[PDB]
From a paper:
Resistance nodulation and cell division (RND) efflux pumps are secondary active antiporters that are ubiquitous across all domains of life. During drug efflux, AcrB undergoes a functional rotation where each of the three protomers sequentially cycles through the conformational states loose (L), tight (T) and open (O).
To elucidate the conformation of AcrB without the crystallisation bias, we assessed the structure of the variants by cryo-EM. In contrast, V612F and V612W mainly showed particles in the T state (72.7 % and 83.9 %, respectively), with these variants displaying trimers predominantly in the TTO (54.9 % V612F, 44.1 % V612W) and TTT (31.8 % V612F, 53.8 % V612W) states.
Author numbering: 1 to 1033
The structure:
Amino acid sequence: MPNFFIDRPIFAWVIAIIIMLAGGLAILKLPVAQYPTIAPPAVTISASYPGADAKTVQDTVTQVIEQNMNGIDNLMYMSSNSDSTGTVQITLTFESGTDADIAQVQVQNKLQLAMPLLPQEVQQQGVSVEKSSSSFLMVVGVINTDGTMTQEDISDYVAANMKDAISRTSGVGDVQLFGSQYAMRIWMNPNELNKFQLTPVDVITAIKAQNAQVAAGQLGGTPPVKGQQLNASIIAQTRLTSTEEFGKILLKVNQDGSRVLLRDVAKIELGGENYDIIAEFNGQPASGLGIKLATGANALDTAAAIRAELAKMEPFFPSGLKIVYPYDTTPFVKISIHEVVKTLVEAIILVFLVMYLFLQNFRATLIPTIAVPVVLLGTFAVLAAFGFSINTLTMFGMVLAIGLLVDDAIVVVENVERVMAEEGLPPKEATRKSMGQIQGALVGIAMVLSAVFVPMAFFGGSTGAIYRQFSITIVSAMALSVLVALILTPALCATMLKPIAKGDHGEGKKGFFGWFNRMFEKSTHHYTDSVGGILRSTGRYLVLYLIIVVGMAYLFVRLPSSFLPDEDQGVFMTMVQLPAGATQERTQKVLNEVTHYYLTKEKNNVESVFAWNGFGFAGRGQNTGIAFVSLKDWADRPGEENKVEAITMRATRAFSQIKDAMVFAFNLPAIVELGTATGFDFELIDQAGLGHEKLTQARNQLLAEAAKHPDMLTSVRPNGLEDTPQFKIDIDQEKAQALGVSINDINTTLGAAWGGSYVNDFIDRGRVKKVYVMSEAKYRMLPDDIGDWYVRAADGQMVPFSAFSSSRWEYGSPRLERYNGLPSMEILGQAAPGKSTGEAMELMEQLASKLPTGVGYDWTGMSYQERLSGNQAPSLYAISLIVVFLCLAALYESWSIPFSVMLVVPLGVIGALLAATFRGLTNDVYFQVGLLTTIGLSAKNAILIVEFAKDLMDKEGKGLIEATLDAVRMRLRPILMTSLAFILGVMPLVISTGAGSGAQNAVGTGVMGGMVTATVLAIFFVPVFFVVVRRRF
């Protein structure tokens, strides 16, 4: 095949140029992100039953929808929750790779079956099916620099001028708004209402009558009378536009002719639609947009558009308005991508340096160095062809490939150089002679190396998505490398090299190379003699191998396990949960202390704090709060004590002293889509109908057990809410009939005053906005305020609520949760420092087994993927080993040689296990990729010996011992040079400590340690395996 391109070297260069420009074109157009779409798609169903308690909401809404949701294709698990506000959120998670649009359609089809069974007010409120994720792409905060506008004043400007543009910006999927659009608030006062003998029903009726839009037809409309000469529309009542217009709404006229206006009985002002959530930025009033990335969109492309969009509305800002970015993932993505690119460049330079040590020639070492850019760019073109995107996982693939793809070009020039030393043949004739001895070695090594990475691409789950990224990159690199080796290297070796005199071994040089060559040759002779002695006593060394295999198995079970390493993303969360029934003011007091601590004790690291009051991952509630914490640039946070893991440990330690509040600081998970916090996600399931009371006791019992193991479990907490006291008011309808008061009036008066009521819409600066009627704050705070409200009887009298009602206190859960249709309570926690999530996973299962019968458990979120990854790990190795064995046999149709080759696999695996154990790493997704790389690399070193040894017997007729000793003698230098090229190739990953180094260290350490033992042990045991196996068969 090289002979087709030796005659026409221009054709070889033309081929290389095409691959070069194909990669360059691909780079300029490929999408860029940190990770691919590896998180499983999720669909969220949102419904509302205003005013109903959590237990009532669950029975009439959640159960109705859930019972129809079974039987949906590719459904992994389903979870739901309902709270005291009447909100319903049912989340369905599908298998990874499932089409989100098809899944959303199927969910929407099933919803129509349960839609008629829901309450009418639920149907009128509207139930929405939406593709959802728990991770924000970025958070764009808006603050006022002089404090002249309140939170709702800021929120409306964001809602009116920004939300519409942002929500329809390219690639934007969802926009949560931290605040509310302006709404006309009618703060009624019961005392003046009672003075004029009015009721909230009268206020609502008057607003609807006087604030309405009425169609009135046209003048001379069709069919017109003959001779009509004018056509014009008639304009009836229109929506009110100002608070003054609302203020002078006429309610009733007194007997003396006086007019009772709306402003005489209520305060009229522009306020928010709801006041449940309060957001502050560094202790300053603020709002913002919780932008979420659409499924299938690019993180970098959308954020650049969003930042460009924000600069567009900047000229239209009111005075004092400022934009801030408390949360932004793009700086982390860019810095992580660049570090691997920096690592990639260092690998090429180091690979160039080590080869120059051996070849000691500028021109000779340049020929194989030219190959690397061609194939490296070629992998980019293959990525574009298959529809992949540039990411850290693909970035790691080329970095790992660096030690592999150069091996084919390394050994070719070695043979050509060796031919010159042995015979002084001209470079073109030496090149032609070289191929006939080497072609099998090049394809065989490339074929088996690509073979081991093929089965990994066929596995499912989020782990399989990670595996595919390494699969496409490495396999395509190997395929292109052997293509380039046959295409490009023979041409330059025949044109760009220079002859080396026959018999030249380089011992006579005066430079450092002279010392290196003489020492290298002398050490080789001693090594060969040692191998010869070993081959005479192979019985001893078989026992050593069996010890190694036993040791490898012992280390594999001793090594802890995990899913994915944590990273310093520059941001972390702190959650605050006050006891049951805590008001909004009390939670704000705790959040002020939390914000004050970060800005004083951690002013060196914390850039800004963005806190919410009334909202959290445990659900909406005045007693729940959460705060984003933004850290400075990684360049400005040197050392380990300034990292997220250290900061959160100190923050949690300090916040433990805070009384009457539970505060936890945690890092974000490895990927933000699969969960809200790092650690394990544990679900406790009632599988027999134990009820809420018994299930809560089991949850408390489990938490007590976890609290007794602080050495391996930390920050163990429930994700739900404790049972809150409830104010129950009973309306005696029999007394209502006696007093002559309509029941609907009683319900309307109670609902509108205390819970607030949405009447209709109004126009505010050309935008449609809601109108709300509610009691003033000071008249709806205590149970004694119930008697302050009156209902007008049919006879015209005013009667208070106390004359026909009674009140009492009850207890009930403010939030109920279900898992897969069964009642459940969610438990969160983290592994103690030094331990791993897998150990926490193992311990939690043991503790859960002690719970009373009828209570089960299941893992979800990150933990579910953690469990799934471990389960299919044995199948990944078993299939990969089988594939390589069959692939090796295909080269010879003999079983002895592939069996001899696979005997070195434990020699490499033990190196990866030892390296991980000494550094304290864990068996995770990255480590599993390292093992498969080590398996291929260990076989590759063996092939360099077996292939040569096999030829010397079948082609030159040398003896078994003679061929093995001879083939080992020449092949030591290619093995050492290729092994070292891999050692320094992945060394930057091992020594990396910057941003994103957690992933790099996990990948680099396993392959580096494995390759060391795959080189030191192999050069002795591989001759033992080959000799013994061929002696037996």
